[PDB]
Amino acid sequence: MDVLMTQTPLSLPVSLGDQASISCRSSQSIVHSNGNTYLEWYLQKPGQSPKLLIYKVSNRFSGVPDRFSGSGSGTDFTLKISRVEAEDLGVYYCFQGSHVPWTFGGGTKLEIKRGSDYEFLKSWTVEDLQKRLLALDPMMEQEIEEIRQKYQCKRQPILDAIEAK
């Protein structure tokens, strides 16, 4: 009693203005008892919370542009981005809500090809570049807080040994 959600690929390096396609394969059929197919696509910006993008295979959530499209055929479901913009970067997750337990996908990171090289960021606008710089602070603060909580994990036994004394 478990349906596997296989997302593919794991990383989709693209340039701005290109077409992107992410697939999600279900181990079993995913039609709900009421006849619907509760296939959902979520996008998570780095350091932020996931946001619903597509629901019921091909229905766009409120606020999602027409560049995002969804499709399916039973066990294969594909999300498509016609013109990748800077706001679309992040990790995409496919999700099923037809059979308990409802399962999530592994995730597909949509990133910029050779974004580490500044020569391939000169085509970007200054506005999108400062947005990209701002997008790293939630990521860094999250990783820092993970280190802090690990040392709180280590600090508590010593604090409790002092409290016993």
Next chain:
Amino acid sequence: EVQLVESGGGLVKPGGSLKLSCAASGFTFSSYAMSWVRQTPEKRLEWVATISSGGSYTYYPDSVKGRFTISRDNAKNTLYLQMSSLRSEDTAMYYCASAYDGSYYFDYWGQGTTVTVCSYEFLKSWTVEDLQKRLLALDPMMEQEIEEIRQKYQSKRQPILDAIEAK
């Protein structure tokens, strides 16, 4: 608009218990189902629990069935997740999310609260001042790990800054 804040996360021993609370603000709380969804440190999303709009129907996956209990109070506009017999696999960031019964499952997510299972104290029962200096010796190591993260992100920010200056 929709505003969900989460609280109650922290440190906990294996086999311990903890209760998380999500405060809803900006919508009729009793007309939408609620759910808890956790994200492992490996950035994997897992559905934890789901409660109906009034609370007469609850759903759990077999991983947390019997140990976790979802509940809600529509008068206080709060959602609750009671956790018992906590295991190492439960260390994750827990999100509280609203639903739209019949269409989609998670449309608006909170900021999330982190639950960390803390897995050693038998040896520590000794000299008190030696414990004091061990606790103070742990601090520079934390600062160096944090600075390593800051250095890595400095290297990540460099190409973006160079592209901005090269305009």
